[PDB]
Homo-oligomer: 82 residues x 2
């Protein structure tokens, strides 16, 4: 994931929070994420999650049980919504 940079800065791919949301929803359902067919609609990218070599980035994904509203948020800042 450090092999993805934009003008030098290392970035988390925009379609990287899709997988995090995808893996999170499958985890809530208890099924394996590679056996679940998902569909993300109107995914808003609000910020860029700046990766750091030799560092640990912790992101919180919150999915609403029935409606599917998800939120990839690093700390108290939103990185992705949909």
């Amino acid at each position: 994931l450090l092999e993805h940079a934009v003008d030098g800065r290392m970035l988390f791919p925009a379609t990287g929070t899709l997988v995090l949301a995808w893996k999170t929803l499958a985890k809530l359902k208890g099924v394996e994420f590679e056996q679940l067919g998902v569909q993300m609609t109107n995914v808003q990218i609000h910020q860029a999650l700046f990766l750091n070599p030799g560092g640990k980035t912790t992101v919180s994904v919150s999915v609403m049980p029935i409606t599917g509203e998800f939120q990839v948020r690093d700390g108290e800042s939103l990185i992705s919504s949909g």
Copy 2:
């Protein structure tokens, strides 16, 4: 709360999940609920939470951190949204 019936059936007041959502949001913020000024918009009541005398009803309230989308849901059934 058992002194609120509609045609005999005991019901949880429609503006009772508002307080549950109100108390939940204040709990997430860490503040006391009676020191927090909230505003609920477009609160959808999907079902009626049927109270039962001498019984325990467990309801789950889920609030999205930044956007405020809340969900009062008994088991896997939605009772209130907004």
